[PDB]
Amino acid sequence: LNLDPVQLTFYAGPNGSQFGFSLDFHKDSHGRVAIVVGAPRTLGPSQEETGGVFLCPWRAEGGQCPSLLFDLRDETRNVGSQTLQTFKARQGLGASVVSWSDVIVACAPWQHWNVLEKTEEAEKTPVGSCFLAQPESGRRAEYSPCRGNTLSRIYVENDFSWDKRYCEAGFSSVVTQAGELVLGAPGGYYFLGLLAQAPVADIFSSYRPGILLWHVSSQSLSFDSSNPEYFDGYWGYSVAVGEFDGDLNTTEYVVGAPTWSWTLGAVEILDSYYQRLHRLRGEQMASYFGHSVAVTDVNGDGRHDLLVGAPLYMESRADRKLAEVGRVYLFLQPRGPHALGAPSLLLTGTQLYGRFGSAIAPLGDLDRDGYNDIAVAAPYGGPSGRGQVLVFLGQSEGLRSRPSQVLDSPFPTGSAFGFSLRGAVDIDDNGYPDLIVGAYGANQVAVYRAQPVVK
Amino acid sequence: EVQLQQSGAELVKPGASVKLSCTASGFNIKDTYVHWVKQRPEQGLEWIGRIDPANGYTKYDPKFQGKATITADTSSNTAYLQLSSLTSEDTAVYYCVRPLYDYYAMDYWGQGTSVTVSSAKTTAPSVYPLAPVCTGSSVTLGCLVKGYFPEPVTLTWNSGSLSSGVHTFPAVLQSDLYTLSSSVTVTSSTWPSQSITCNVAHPASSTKVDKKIEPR
Amino acid sequence: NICTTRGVSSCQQCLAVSPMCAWCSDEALPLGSPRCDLKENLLKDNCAPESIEFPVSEARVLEDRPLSDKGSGDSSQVTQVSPQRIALRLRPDDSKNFSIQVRQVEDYPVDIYYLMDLSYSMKDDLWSIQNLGTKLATQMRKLTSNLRIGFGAFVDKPVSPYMYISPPEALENPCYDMKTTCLPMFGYKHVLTLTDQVTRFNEEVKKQSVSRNRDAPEGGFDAIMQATVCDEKIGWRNDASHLLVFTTDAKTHIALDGRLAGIVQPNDGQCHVGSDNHYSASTTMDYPSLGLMTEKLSQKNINLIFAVTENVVNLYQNYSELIPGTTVGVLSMDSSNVLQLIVDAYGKIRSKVELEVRDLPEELSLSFNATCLNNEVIPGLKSCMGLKIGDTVSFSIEAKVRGCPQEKEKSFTIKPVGFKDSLIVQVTFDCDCACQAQAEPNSHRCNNGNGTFECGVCRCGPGW
Amino acid sequence: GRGDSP
Amino acid sequence: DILMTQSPSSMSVSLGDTVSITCHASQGISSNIGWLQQKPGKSFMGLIYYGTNLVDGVPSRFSGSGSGADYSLTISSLDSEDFADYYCVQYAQLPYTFGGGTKLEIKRADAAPTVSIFPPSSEQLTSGGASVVCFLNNFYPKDINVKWKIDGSERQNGVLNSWTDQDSKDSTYSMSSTLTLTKDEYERHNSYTCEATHKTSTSPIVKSFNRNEC
Ligand SMILES: *[C@@H]1O[C@H](CO)[C@@H](O[C@@H]2O[C@H](CO)[C@@H](O[C@@H]3O[C@H](CO)[C@@H](O)[C@H](O[C@H]4O[C@H](CO)[C@@H](O)[C@H](O)[C@@H]4O)[C@@H]3O)[C@H](O)[C@H]2NC(C)=O)[C@H](O)[C@H]1NC(C)=O
Ligand SMILES: *[C@@H]1O[C@H](CO)[C@@H](O[C@@H]2O[C@H](CO)[C@@H](O)[C@H](O)[C@H]2NC(C)=O)[C@H](O)[C@H]1NC(C)=O
Ligand SMILES: *[C@@H]1O[C@H](CO)[C@@H](O)[C@H](O)[C@H]1NC(C)=O
Ligand SMILES: [Ca+2]
Ligand SMILES: [Ca+2]
Ligand SMILES: [Ca+2]
Ligand SMILES: [Ca+2]
Ligand SMILES: [Mn+2]
Ligand SMILES: [Mn+2]
Ligand SMILES: [Mn+2]
């Protein structure tokens, strides 16, 4: 409703670096807000794409940002009669970033890893890896829970059980208030997908450079399965957290599995022990129901509600025809211990191939009316197909079925304007929460400032 | 807290088979590798092998292949080490080990398990008083505990009364039976004036004999 | 009647009252006789027959070629829709009816491009293409004298994690880690352009062999897209039925899956098969969505046939419903005939006739009465089912114009989905009179130069 | 298996 | 198997000192080494892993260093508990292999042994045996050699020695030698002697006695 579309702020990164693929707000020890941006195709030391992270200070004019430097050198360790190897080439560092406290977490989902023992090997596979940084102290650390030293032969003998060689840990990342990092690894367990969790504090204290294979006792990974419904479901394609059981001591996880059950798609709500509480199934095959998930209380009943994106959902139209436009599903949490019912609201895209529902960002209370609002992205939507972001306001009855505002892309075609969103943070400290919109296609980030309501 | 409680001391005969255990406390054995290490006085430390309790795969030093067998039952959260066709050389203290963070390290150790391989059956100690020969300023007496098995034996002078100024020497295996000796020093005006008694106890045979030192 | 009681001021208004109204522009009209009345009432008042302005909604044909008995031979001079063009004329709020006939012509040319899964899992499914070209020309010969058959192959996007990338030998031989050997992984490759030489098909197939990759879902959809948009290369003929047969034993990758290989760029629906006959965008572009696949298939007029194994028949039976006009066949070792399957599919394909309207003006609204099977009329229906090749159907149509549009000359088309031929309806809106073309602007009869005398009455000129 | 194999 | 040559075998030092142990390997091991500590009469404790990284809980006065085939553990400002056994272990290859070990002992001024010979007791003698004991108490350094003589001539068969760890509150060592003959064989001879040889004196310390005499 009251985001300022006239006077935006632009941050830009290196050409072809996909600067803006992922972003997030970041407060230092003093509460000073800065933007953290991921550029997964930024050139490394050998003029080869390794990815990179940028930490942008708030500035009404924006501009260029300094790099949050990480180690980008491939590592080797000859230990226990084995050879451990990390391969960072085309790893996609910054394919996802999240900030918690004064710590930043940037993940390279396609960082490869291999082990050699004589004439055998584990296989060179994308286990992924996360890089943790504390900008103020200069502290650094890593977390790569899917690394292993089992040889190829073993997996074959065991019928490829608990095979975590393709996890791509960090595909999606979230952090609980308590400070537990939760990584979505859609490739884990031979493409079933898995979740890995570990306390940030413990990740730091247990890490040392050069070791490559170390233990994090407090870590917790989800489980494998023999059920074909889970096969190639990419469990952990997207992740989120919230409160969905009434017990405020426990934190619940929300996992998207966009191709679950033969591309039907689904999203499940679990406890910290990966026990399923609810499961919402897709409405249509290949719609990619679960591509994105958001958690926030939109009707002001104190209970977190769920939002699910299906960016490829095809809408039924005249003469028995279907039009790929995308869709968002709202699920309101019922009072007390009850199952989430049918969707309370179905928001559907308008532009063909617009991919409405590709991203969904909680804005907090944008207009300050007492109900939380959200933003929904259609990266290839708008009459010009350049990208569009639609704001929907909260209300006692959930959400408004029509958008309160529509942000058209300030960039040129192909920018993927809206592929990443982040809100609910007041970056200019004017009392109103703001929105940052990434357009990796254009290697830029647009900042929208919320202003006092005009009407 | 990580703690490895190994089994109690074992005492077996040559040719027998013993099975040591290493229960985990404050964590799940399945977490990391579990190595077994052998220690001897002269030969020092020797790596036997290791096991991943999660999958049950094991690695051994080719020296112990056949003699040592490492296993693990995640149910009881315990790892085991079985030794067969035992001999005198197998007499050693064994330690189970696991890394802290580094997958391949050796950071946490169990308290240890003493193993002794002998045929000698339970025998009572023969205590002998050692009085000097027939002058100086200070005098030194002694006690000789000879021919007992197995260890240990608690020796005391005057039932613990005389504590300071005493030297009890480590036991020594005299061909399948242990021997031990202890001295004690005082002034010439203290002996034989003040009576001194050698008090030895052997819990195994349940015998606590006492011998008063007699001057010649 | 409503014509007189409406109190019209001009001829143009008179006709807008009702389709059964007429205007009289006669000079010698009685004192208070209404110019706007039924044609019978006007002639009853000694009105000059020529002064009568009474347009009649008609509908005559312009092109009426007869339906072809055989679709064989000729240079595609076949007619399967009659008539091919008609001129429609309507007056305000009126409506006229017309009819169209459609025939599923016998012996129509057929193209059959075969898209073959050659992933490692397809070792035990190769049996089905062994002597295909011949076994495919035999049962088809009985439905067409002009058949062309082509062949293409696919596996998956050749990139990690789909592709094995270690050891170095695993690249040239994906089966390196086993005792056996196989082809290096490839996305999609065109093999044989649509040809009538069946032995070319047979001989090409014999030279094919499987590859191998990691994940069960394969990149068949990438291939379906290219086989569709690469016309000149596949060789689809302008005037032929296009059959695209898709065989596989496994699930399929879909849009947004590519992200697991760092691929995020949406499929652009463009051709990317070069002179080397390989899909070059295989590793830089995401798989296509069903929506996009549907768009292109419809555009190039391709009929997709899912000839998959019984273990995934339900999966693809569900996809075929999101892609209208798609048929599925069970690829087993026991059926009517596993690969007459294609004949049975073509049968299902040409067992329906559904009309489609393009460029229909906002003012016009159409209705349909279908006549299928044996002169059985089904109202409000514009599609037929349960047809055989050689059967003819007909539809009664009614265009109901609403009011009178600004543009008097419009035209729309009625074409059966999947058909080459169509019916062009050239509409003409007649809401005026010939006397208007001979008016008197600034006439001396009308308020002394402040009016325009047309059709007998005086009209307030422009500017008032 | 769960992969590309017969 | 990779050999681990650890040196020195031992060293006598005082508190507050900054000593350094070294460990050589038969080949490179890319900082895949670990340092251990074993306090007297107790289990092992991890000090260092992967060359330089301290095990959680270990004091910062400890530090591991080196690279290739040569590494060194250093203890800045020795503490009272630091006096113990230390070993190095390589896990670059299987089987894992340890060093010989290094024992840190408390240094002090030298001290002469307090020799004391003891003939067999009446009881033992009637039992058909005869043991002559020779205690050598409180002396420094630990190096020392005992020699038994019967009728002036050396005797090596039937001797059992035993040493004590460096005593706590005086930092000295003690020794116990025991020559065990048969009753009969013991009576074949008259004189019995034990000679202690320590750096404290260039001339050996002697203590004798005569059977059938007192
Ligand atoms: C191809 O499409 C078909 C048709 O859509 C599809 O078959 C369907 O499978 C689903 C899932 O197995 C079936 O749904 C069930 O319907 C029965 C009633 O017949 C219900 O009792 C079941 O309820 C269970 O699950 C619910 C949650 O989903 C729970 O709330 C409930 O308590 C039960 O546990 C269930 O909804 C459906 O019946 C069929 N449809 C038909 C017409 O057969 C098939 O899966 C698709 N195939 C592939 C591979 O894509
Ligand atoms: C389609 O068929 C319907 C009958 O099902 C026709 O409806 C009748 O049309 C006649 C024309 O003379 C009228 O007299 C009747 O009043 C109509 N009946 C009903 C129930 O509406 C209709 O004419 C046909 N339409 C087309 C497109 O030809
Ligand atoms: C319209 O329908 C009538 C019957 O109601 C029929 O006689 C006539 O032929 C139809 N007109 C045309 C042009 O098809
Ligand atoms: Ca909870
Ligand atoms: Ca709510
Ligand atoms: Ca609001
Ligand atoms: Ca603000
Ligand atoms: Mn396959
Ligand atoms: Mn198969
Ligand atoms: Mn595949």
In the reported structure, the alpha carbon of residue A295 is separated from the centroid of ligand 6 by a whole-number distance in angstroms of 15
Q: Which atom of ligand 1 lies closest to the CA of A264?
A: 50
In sequence order, the β-bridge partners of residue B126 are B146
Nearest to D6 among C124, C156, C213 (CB): C124
Given a contact cutoff of 8 angstroms between Cβ atoms, the answer to whether A66 and A55 are in contact is yes
- Strand-pairing partners, residue C24, are C52
Query: CB of E65 within 8 Å of any CB in chain B?
Result: no
- List of residues 6+ apart from A343 with CB closer than 8 A: A329, A330, A331
Task: Starting at the earlier edge strand, list the strands of the sheet with E191-197.
Answer: E153-155, E145-150, E191-197, E205-210
Chains that touch C (3 or more CB pairs under 8 A): A, D
Task: Give residues preceding each break in chain B, C–N over 2.5 A.
Answer: 134
Give CA–CA dist A287/A270, Å, rounded. 23
Which of E107, E134, E166 represents a domain boundary (last residue)?
E107
Distances in Å between the Cα of E191 and the Cα atoms of B32, B178, E210, E212 are 64, 28, 5, 10
Give the DSSP H or E segment for C317: helix C313-322
C269 touches C296 (CB < 8 A): yes
CB-side exposure of B92: number of CA atoms within 13 Å? 20
Interatomic CA distance for residues C241 and C419, integer angstroms: 9
Q: Please, are residues C148 and C113 in contact by the beta-carbon 8 Å criterion?
A: no
> Residue A208: which of E30, E50, E92 has the nearest Cβ?
E50
Tokens 């001879």 belong to: E189
> Cα torsion at A221, A222, A226, A232 (round to 10°)?
-100
Residue type present at position A79: V
* Residue of B25, B27, B19 whose CA lies nearest to B4: B25
State the sign of the Cα–Cα–Cα–Cα dihedral B142, B146, B152, B158: negative
E45 and E57 co-located in one domain:
yes
Q: Are strands A327-331 and A305-310 parallel, antiparallel or unpaired?
A: antiparallel
Number of neighbouring beta carbons within 10 Å of residue B151: 16
Residue C369 Cβ < 6 Å to ligand 2: yes
Q: How many domains does chain E have?
A: 2
Q: Within the 1-6 window of chain D, which residues sit less than 8 Å (CB to CB) from chain A? A: 1-3
Domain end marker among B119, B151, B170: B119
The preferred substitution site among A227, A232, A260, A262 for testing ligand 1, maximizing ligand atoms within 8 Å of CB, is: A262
Domain match, B149 and B55 both: no
**Per-residue DSSP letter, A404:** S
B138 with B60, same domain? no
Whether B129 and B107 map to the same domain: the answer is no
CA dist., res. B165 & res. B188, Å (int): 14
Q: Are E46 and E54 in contact, with CB atoms under 8 Å apart?
A: no
Beta bridge partners of A121: A116
Taking the Cβ of residue E62 and every Cβ of chain B, the question of whether any pair is shorter than 8 Å is answered with no
Measured in angstroms, the resolution is 3.0
Q: Name the minimum distance, in Å, from the CA of E18 to any CA of chain B.
A: 24
From ligand 9's centre to the CA of C310, what distance in Å?
A: 10
Cα A163–chain centre separation: 23
Our answer on whether the CB atom of C398 is closer than 6 Å to any ligand 2 atom is yes
- HSE-CB at C307 with a 13 A cutoff on CA atoms is 31
Tell me C126's DSSP state.
G
Count each helix (H run) and each strand (E run) in chain A, helices first. Answer: 4, 37
For residue A114, give the nearest of C166, C215, C251 by CB distance: C166
Listed residues B98, B119, B140: the one ending a domain: B119
HSE of A322, CA atoms in CB hemisphere, 13 A: 24
Best to test chain A binding among B102, B106, B107, B108 (most A CBs inside 10 Å):
B102
The most distant pair of C-alpha atoms in chain A lies apart, rounded to whole Å, by 73
Judged by CB atoms closer than 8 Å, whether chains meet at B172 and E118 is answered as: no
**From the alpha carbon of A263, which atom of ligand 1 is closest?**
50
What residue spans define the domains of chain A? Answer: 1-455
Give A139's strand partners.
Answer: A134
Separation between Cα atoms, residue A391 and residue A328, nearest integer Å: 13
CA C148 to CA C242: how far, in whole Å? 10
Query: Cβ contacts (< 8 Å) between B49 and chain E: which residues?
Result: 95
Domain, as residue range, for E204: 108-211
CA-CA distance, B113 to C211, in Å (whole number)? 57
Do residues E77 and E148 share a domain?
Answer: no
> For residue B172, what are its two tokens?
């020594």
Closest ligand 1 atom to the C-alpha of A281?
28
| CA–CA gap between residue B153 and residue B173 (Å, rounded) | 13
Check if the beta carbon of residue E86 is closer than 8 Å to that of residue E102. Answer: yes
Phi/psi for A423 (5° steps) reads -140, -160
Residues of chain A in contact with residue E30, where contact means CB-CB under 8 angstroms, are: 77-79
Q: Are residues B20 and B105 in the same domain?
A: yes
Is A114 within 8 Å of C261 when comparing Cβ atoms?
Answer: no
Which residues of chain B make contact with A77, given a CB cutoff of 8 A?
none
Bridge partner list, B179: B146, B172
The domains of chain C, with CATH numbers, are 1-55 (3.30.1680.10), 56-104+354-464 (2.60.40.1510), 105-353 (3.40.50.410)
Shared domain check, E161 and E102: no
The kind and range of the H/E element at C132 are helix C132-138
Q: What is the distance in angstroms between the Cα of A158 and the nearest Cα belonging to chain E?
A: 25
Q: Prior bond to E8 cis, omega within 30?
A: yes
Residue A157, number of CB atoms within 10 A of its CB:
9
- CB of C379 closer than 6 angstroms to any ligand 2 atom: yes
On the question of a cis peptide bond just before residue C109, with omega within 30 degrees of 0, the verdict is no
Residue whose entry in the numeric block shows the structure tokens 């006959």 = C277
Judgement on whether residues E180 and E126 belong to the same structural domain of the protein: yes
Structure-block tokens of residue E13: 């030092």
| Element housing E122 (H / E) | helix E122-126
Same domain, B125 and B112: no
Same domain, E23 and E83: yes
Between CA E125 and CA C27 the distance in angstroms is 172
Within 8 A by CB and 6+ apart from A378, the residues are A326, A349, A351, A354, A355, A356, A357, A358, A387, A388, A389, A390, A418
Task: Give the distance from residue D3's alpha carbon to the nearest chain A alpha carbon, in angstroms.
Answer: 8
User: Are residues B113 and B132 both part of a single domain?
Assistant: no
Interatomic CA distance for residues E131 and E137, integer angstroms: 19
Q: Which residue has the tokens 């003040």?
A: B194
Question: Per the structure block, which two tokens stand in for B22?
Answer: 């290493």
State the residue range of the domain holding B41. Answer: 1-119
Here the tokens at position A192 are 């079933």
Q: Is E104 strand, coil or helix? A: strand
Of B202, B147, B203, give the one whose Cα is nearest residue B175: B147
Q: Are residues B61 and B131 in the same domain?
A: no
Pairing of strands C423-429, C85-90: parallel
Rounded (10°) CA dihedral C340, C342, C346, C348? 80
Distances from the Cα of A295 to the Cα of A282, A362, B45, C144, angstroms: 18, 7, 57, 60
Q: Buried (b) or exposed (e) across C129-145, using 16+ Cβ within 10 A?
A: beebbebbbebbeebbe
DSSP per residue, A169-236: BTSEEEE-TT-EEEEEETTHHHHT-EEEEEEHHHHHHT--TTT-SB--TT-EE------GGGTT--TT
On the question of a cis peptide bond just before residue A145, with omega within 30 degrees of 0, the verdict is no
Neighbors of chain D by Cβ distance (3+ pairs < 8 Å) = A, C
The values of phi and psi at residue B98, to 5°, are -150, 150
Give the whole-angstrom CA distance, residue C463 versus residue C460.
Answer: 9
DSSP β-ladder status, C241-248 and C110-117? parallel
A412: which strand partners? none
Give the span between the Cα atoms of C463 and E137, in whole angstroms: 139
Structure tokens at C197: 């030489």
Q: Is C2 helix (H, G, I), strand (E, B) or coil?
A: coil
Burial category of A221 from C-beta neighbours within 10 Å (exposed 0-12, middle 13-18, buried 19 and up): buried
Taking the CA of residue C98 as reference, the ligand 3 atom at the shortest distance is 14
Lookup: tokens for C70: 């055989």
Residue A250 and residue A270 in contact, taking contact as beta carbons nearer than 8 Å = no
Q: Does any CB of chain B come closer than 8 Å to the CB of residue E170?
A: no
Q: Which residues does a gap of C–N over 2.5 Å follow in chain C?
A: none
Give the A:D interface size as CB pairs under 8 Å. 9
For ligand 3, atom 13, which residue shows the shortest CA distance? C98
Q: At what angle do helices C313-322 and C290-299 cross, to 10 degrees?
A: 70
Which residue in this structure is represented by tokens 């059980």? A161
Beta strands across the sheet bearing A388-392 = A359-364, A373-378, A388-392, A405-408
**Which tokens go with A50?**
């390794």
**Exposed e or buried b for every residue in A279-318, given b needs 16+ CB within 10 A?**
ebebbbbbbbbbbbbbbbbbbeeebbbbbbbbbbbbbeee
Distance CA(A172)–CA(A234), nearest Å, equals 11
CATH number at residue B190: 2.60.40.10
Residues E203, E130 share a domain: yes
**Please, which residues bridge with residue A184 across strands?**
A172, A195
| E strand residue ranges, chain E | 4-7, 10-13, 19-25, 33-38, 44-49, 53-54, 62-67, 70-75, 85-90, 97-98, 102-106, 114-118, 129-139, 145-150, 153-155, 159-160, 173-182, 191-197, 205-210
Residue ending a domain, choose from E67, E91, E107: E107
Question: d(Cα A92, Cα A106) in Å, to the nearest integer?
Answer: 10
Coil, strand or helix at C202: helix
Residue C90 near residue C430, CB atoms below 8 Å: yes
Q: Check residue C44 and give left, alpha or beta (phi > 0: left; psi -120 to 50: alpha).
A: alpha
The C-alpha torsion from B202 through B205 and B206 to B207, rounded to 10°, is -60
A247 Cα to the center of ligand 4, angstroms: 4
Query: Which domain-ending residue is among E75, E107, E139?
Result: E107
- Which residues, by Cβ under 5 Å, contact ligand 6, an ion? A 365, 367, 369, 371, 373, 393-394
CB atoms within 10 A of CB A272: 16
d(Cα A291, Cα C339) in Å, to the nearest integer?
38
d(CA E160, CA E179): 7
Q: The CATH number of the domain where E118 resides is what?
A: 2.60.40.10
Number of structural domains (chain B) is 2
**Closest by Cα among B3, B32, B8 to B20:** B8
Query: Is the domain of E93 the same as that of E160?
Result: no
The tokens for C210 are 């499987």
- Contact at 8 Å (CB) between C290 and C319? yes
Closest CA to C267 of C278, C255, C249: C255
B176 CA from centroid of ligand 1 (Å): 78
Which residue of A110, A231, A351 to mutate against C (max C Cβ within 10 Å)? A110
With CA atoms as reference, report the closest residue to C57 among C86, C83, C91.
Answer: C91
Any atom of ligand 1 within 6 Å of the Cβ of C314: yes
Length of chain C: 464
Residue A371 CA to ligand 6 center (angstroms) comes to: 4
Taking the C-alpha atoms of residue C427 and residue E136, their distance in angstroms, rounded to an integer, is: 132
From CA A183, how far away is CA A203, in angstroms rounded? 13
Do the beta carbons of residue A229 and residue A261 sit within 8 Å? yes
Residue of A183, A45, A180, A162 whose CA lies nearest to A106: A183
User: Side-chain half-sphere of A344: how many Cα atoms within 13 Å?
Assistant: 18
- Token look-up 């008083």 returns B129
- Superfamily of domain A1-455, CATH level 4: Integrin alpha, N-terminal (2.130.10.130)
Residue that terminates a domain, selected from B85, B119, B153: B119
